[PDB]
RNA sequence: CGGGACCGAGGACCGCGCUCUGCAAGGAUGCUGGCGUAAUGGUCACCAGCGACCCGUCUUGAAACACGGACCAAGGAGUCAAGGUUUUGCGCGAGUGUUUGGGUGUAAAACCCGCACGCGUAAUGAAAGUGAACGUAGGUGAGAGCUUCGGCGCAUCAUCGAC
RNA sequence: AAAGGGAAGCGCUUGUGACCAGACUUGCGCCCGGCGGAUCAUCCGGUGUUCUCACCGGUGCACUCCGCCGGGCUCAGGCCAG
């Protein structure tokens, strides 16, 4: 069904925090690592450099963990898991685990449409 | 279930332990008349109105 | 446990005399004060003695059976006659026993 | 920027026990309620002493309790937030009403034999919720080998 | 008086017999101490390994 | 004594077999749990008086704890099956939840769960067909 | 008295008020239009304006010098034992420690047992040796808490005494 | 597929092209009309319970309850805006 009324979702930053020199070295994954060298310009926060993550980028407490539809994802593996969202169909949306077979997926989607629960990946294995 | 008492009485150097709490029902303890009759009046509610 | 160590947190950021042939069994004399003397009496008869159901009976205490050789004089005794059999005794302990009305017997 | 020569200081006292004892958690909840809803300083002191550790709660013996029972304190209820131990050097135990966190077996037996009463802290909260007619006692804090070698 | 517990037969129905509950069932329930002792005894059947 | 609902909550507040913990919330698989949330208010296995609502073939099935049969699990549940009008079901559920002081704080949650089950027992309307959108999906 | 920009946090009522049928008074509502899909939004590649030295190590006050780095995968560096010490949790408590050993076992588990022994309960002296109450276990000044509202006074501190 | 007048790579912000995730499709409540049924109110007996609340069997005889189908009305509904 439609989600519960909420404040607008505001993302302070949508770009990821890329690791320094990961764009030049293939042995460096792009996942964030804080520079610990004393002369590092990203660590010393010179202008024109990569930003570093900090708690000031944090998301709104009324809005954190919410998808753009206004729901929170709940991972389900079976019908007994999707029936835990009987009382939360306006705040939580079911998300079927990746290793659930197609028959069980049909069962979960049928039960979720009975309960009025949104499934985020209902088109899978069709 | 008849021999359990004799088993726990036959243990040397050990006794059934004394508890630090005699009445484990905190709701009865708090909402009893003996405590509630001497309490100060409430200074607010669960939800506080925003003043300004 | 390894997982609670700070190193896992730091992952990423690095006269007189000489006595030849001393035998310690020569100098074995444990000591007990008179304030713990009634603790050597078993509990029930101790309670009877302290309450006063034994006005014609005096307890005899062997300190060597309990593991003591000298009776020392710290504390005070009640007004009960007690026979104490000990290898050693101090003057103040024996004096307080005589005030209490007992006698200190010397044994070996 | 703002010039702050002084610095705001975080609290240097315990707000919650480190113990995982669920009974102690229930006692802490009860005395939090009592300290918040009563004006008696006894409840606040008892809550703070429940927060403390073992070396900050030294044992209190029956000889110490009998010493503090003298001079008009014979009818007051003795409150110790630490354990109560037995003293063999005390031959005659006076009649007393003691509420403690815990008792040793000898201390409890000798109190009951002398004719007193042993209480827990929740029974103390039931009978004396404001700490009326109470004698709050502590043991010798500096009586440790570590404190001697300090 | 102390509480009683019903004795059931081989048919799953009560036999009419009741027995006094032992005093160990009123002992304090201490999960922290149970965890400590369980952590201690779970290592007492281990076999050593070394290179 | 040494056992109470407060103690059972202190024991099982961090872990029990009903607990379902994820990033976006903590749930409970209890039968006596209204709203399926892990809290002292809704821990039916913890609390001495508790309610639970289960769907039936038609209508709801409400179980309640019996205070005098706590140590007898086979006879500890008072069960009523409501296969009737929804308004009468809500009336009887609120009556057993609030009239005699048997967990009056669970009244709204119990009526809400009964309404949710009665909604779920309705026939499901067919979904509209998915519209293909854009360039690569459309062609 | 106009003209313009940015913003709309909260979510039943309560309050302070006023111009008092109500209100601009403890946080935006009312009306209307187009569209209902890639239109908004997002990701990727590129162009444009502005910004932006190559990382690690070492040195001193600092740079500079110097050293390592063709690239990728996997491996790769504060560990364990014993002995102390401080702090935390727990059990018992003037005692405490079953597990050298014996009993038992569903068998390297779990359960049970007790003699000795270790540490603690007494110190001091090189040693022989001796060995801790004058007093409600002392007086005075503070001291949480309690109080019958006169005081009693925990821990602890300072000081004078006693053994 | 794209860029290239002696470096490329990176940050902020638009644009172009390519490719996408959502959201939405209507719900709820009244007034009528037409159907299909009596798990409507009261009363009686039994049973269980929280000891006054419910379930079960009879009683309803259709101005009462419960679903369905056609309309009408009110409210709430997506994106960008004045």
Nucleotides of G under 7 A from a protein CB: 9-10, 14, 26-27, 37-38, 42-43, 51-58, 63, 71-73, 78-80, 85-95, 97, 108-114, 121-122, 126-128, 130-133, 136-137, 144-148, 151-157
Report the alpha-carbon angle C3-C5-C10, nearest 5.
105
Q: How was this structure determined?
A: cryo-EM
C86, containing H or E segment: strand C83-86
Query: Annotation-wise, does A39 bind a ligand?
Result: yes
Name the nt closest to C30 by C-alpha to C1'.
Answer: G122
Name the nt closest to A20 by C-alpha to C1'.
Answer: H10
Q: How far is the CA of A55 from the C1' of G87 (A)?
A: 32
Q: Which two tokens stand for residue D87?
A: 């003293």
In order of C32, C82, C84, F9, the CA distances from C70 in angstroms are 7, 16, 11, 58
Which parts of C1-103 fold into alpha helices (H)? Answer: 6-9, 43-51, 63-66, 91-100
D88 and C75 in contact by Cβ < 8 A? no
Q: Beta carbon of D77 within 7 Å of strand G?
A: no
Which residue of D lies nearest to F10 if distances are taken between CA atoms? Answer: D22
In order of A57, A120, D130, F22, F78, the CA distances from A76 in angstroms are 30, 11, 52, 11, 31
Interface residue B32 vs chain F (CB under 8 A): no
Q: How far is the CA of F85 from the C1' of H65 (A)?
A: 9
In total, chain B counts a number of residues equal to: 52
- Cβ atoms within 10 A of the Cβ of F38, count? 21
Q: What is the 3-state secondary structure (H, E, C) of F19-51?
A: EEEECCEEEECCCCCCCCECCCCCCCCCCCCCE
In order of C47, C48, C57, the CA distances from C53 in angstroms are 9, 5, 9
The position carrying tokens 């309670």 is C47
Interface residue A122 vs chain F (CB under 8 A): no
Report the distance separating Cα F4 and Cα B19, nearest Å: 14
Task: For residue D41, give the nearest of D132, D120, D126, D123 by alpha carbon.
Answer: D132
Task: Identify the contact set of chain D against chain F, taking CB-CB distances under 8 A.
Answer: 22-23, 25-26
A87 and F20 in contact by Cβ < 8 A? no
Q: How far is the CA of D44 from the C1' of H7 (A)?
A: 73
Q: DSSP code of D54? A: S
Sheet holding C31-33, edge to edge: C31-33, C70-72, C88-89
- Coil, strand or helix: which one is A81? helix
Residues contacting residue C71 through CB under 8 Å, at least 6 positions apart: C31, C32, C33, C34, C37, C63, C84, C86, C88, C89, C90, C93, C94, C97, C104
In order of B5, B20, D106, E31, F19, the CA distances from E25 in angstroms are 10, 17, 24, 15, 27
Q: Which two tokens stand for residue F96?
A: 């057993």
Closest CA of chain F from A1, distance in Å: 12
Q: How far is the CA of A23 from the C1' of H7 (A)?
A: 16
State this model's resolution in angstroms: 2.8
Beta bridge pairs of residue C60 = C83
Task: For residue F13, give the nearest of E39, D25, D14 by alpha carbon.
Answer: D25
The position carrying tokens 């998300």 is A95
**CB-CB contact of A76 with A119 (8 Å):** no
Q: Which two tokens stand for residue A49?
A: 């450099």
A72 and F117 in contact by Cβ < 8 A? no
Residues contacting residue C83 through CB under 8 Å, at least 6 positions apart: C58, C59, C60, C61, C102, C103, C105
Residues contacting residue F134 through CB under 8 Å, at least 6 positions apart: none
Collect all residues of chain E within an 8 Å Cβ-Cβ radius of residue D20. 31-32
Name the nt closest to C89 by C-alpha to C1'.
Answer: G131
The position carrying tokens 């039960």 is A111
Q: How far is the CA of D76 from the C1' of H70 (A)?
A: 86
Q: Sign of torsion, CA A22 A28 A29 A32?
A: negative
Q: Sign of torsion, CA F30 F33 F38 F43?
A: negative
Report the distance separating Cα D105 and Cα D84, nearest Å: 10
Report the distance separating Cα D59 and Cα D46, nearest Å: 16
With 0-12 / 13-18 / 19 or more C-beta atoms within 10 angstroms meaning exposed / middle / buried, residue C43 is: exposed
E22 and B4 in contact by Cβ < 8 A? yes
Collect all residues of chain E within an 8 Å Cβ-Cβ radius of residue B22. none
Which parts of chain D fold into alpha helices (H)? Answer: 22-37, 41-51, 62-68, 105-114, 121-127, 145-149
């Amino acid at each position: 069904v439609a989600a519960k009324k909420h404040v607008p979702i505001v993302k302070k930053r949508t770009k990821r925090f890329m690791r320094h020199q990961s764009d030049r070295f293939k042995c460096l994954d792009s996942a964030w690592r804080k520079p610990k060298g004393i002369d590092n310009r990203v660590r010393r926060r010179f202008k024109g450099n990569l930003a570093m993550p900090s708690i000031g980028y944090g998301s709104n407490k009324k809005t954190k963990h919410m998808m753009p539809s206004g729901h929170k994802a709940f991972l389900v593996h079976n019908v007994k898991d999707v029936e835990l969202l009987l009382m939360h169909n306006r705040t939580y949306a079911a998300e079927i685990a990746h290793n659930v077979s197609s028959r069980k997926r049909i069962d979960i989607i049928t039960r979720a449409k009975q309960l009025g629960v949104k499934v985020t990946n209902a088109k899978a294995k069709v | 279930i008849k021999q359990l008492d004799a088993v726990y009485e036959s243990k040397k150097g050990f006794f059934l332990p004394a508890n630090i709490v005699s009445q484990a029902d905190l709701s009865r303890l708090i909402n009893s008349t003996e405590i509630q009759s001497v309490l100060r009046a409430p200074k607010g509610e669960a939800r506080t109105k925003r003043a300004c | 446990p390894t997982r609670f160590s700070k190193t896992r947190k730091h992952r990423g950021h690095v006269v007189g005399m000489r006595h030849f042939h001393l035998l310690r069994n020569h100098y074995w004399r444990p000591s007990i004060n008179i304030d713990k003397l009634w603790s050597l009496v078993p509990s029930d008869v101790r309670e009877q003695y302290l309450s006063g159901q034994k006005k014609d009976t005096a307890p005899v205490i062997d300190l060597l059976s309990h593991g003591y050789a000298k009776l020392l004089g710290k504390g005070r005794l009640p007004e009960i006659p007690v026979v104490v059999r000990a290898r050693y005794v101090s003057a103040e302990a024996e004096r307080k026993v005589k005030e209490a009305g007992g006698v200190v017997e010397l044994v070996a | 920027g703002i010039d702050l020569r002084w610095k705001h200081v975080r609290s240097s006292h315990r707000k919650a026990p480190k113990s995982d004892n669920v009974y102690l958690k229930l006692l802490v909840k009860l005395y939090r309620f009592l300290a918040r809803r009563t004006e008696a300083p006894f409840n606040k002191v008892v809550l703070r002493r429940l927060f403390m550790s073992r070396i900050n709660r030294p044992p209190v013996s029956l000889s110490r309790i009998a010493r503090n029972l003298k001079n008009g304190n014979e009818k007051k209820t003795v409150v110790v937030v630490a354990t109560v131990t037995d003293d063999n050097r005390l031959l005659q135990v006076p009649k007393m009403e003691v509420a403690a966190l815990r008792f040793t077996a000898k201390a409890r037996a000798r109190i009951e034999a002398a004719g007193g009463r042993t209480l827990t802290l929740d029974q103390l909260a039931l009978e004396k919720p404001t700490g009326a007619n109470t004698l709050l006692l502590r043991g010798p804090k500096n009586a440790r080998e570590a404190v001697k070698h300090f | 008086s102390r509480p009683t517990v019903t004795v059931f037969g081989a048919d799953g129905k009560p036999t009419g017999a009741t027995e006094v509950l032992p005093k160990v069932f009123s002992a304090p329930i201490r999960p922290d101490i149970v965890k400590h002792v369980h952590t201690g005894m779970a290592k007492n059947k281990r076999q050593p390994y070394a290179v | 004594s040494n056992v109470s609902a407060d103690l059972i909550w202190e024991v099982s507040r961090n872990y029990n077999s009903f607990l379902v913990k994820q990033r976006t919330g903590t749930f409970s698989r209890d039968a006596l749990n209204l709203t399926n949330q892990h809290s002292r208010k809704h821990a039916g296995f913890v609390n001495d008086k508790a309610l639970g609502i289960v769907p039936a073939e038609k209508g709801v099935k409400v179980i309640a704890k019996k205070v005098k049969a706590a140590n007898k699990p086979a006879s500890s549940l008072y069960t009523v099956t409501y296969k009737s009008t929804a308004r009468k079901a809500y009336k009887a559920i609120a009556s057993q939840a609030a009239k005699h002081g048997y967990r009056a704080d669970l009244r709204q949650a119990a009526v809400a769960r009964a309404s949710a089950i009665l909604r779920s027992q309705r026939p499901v309307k067919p979904e509209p067909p998915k519209k293909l959108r854009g360039a690569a999906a459309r062609r």
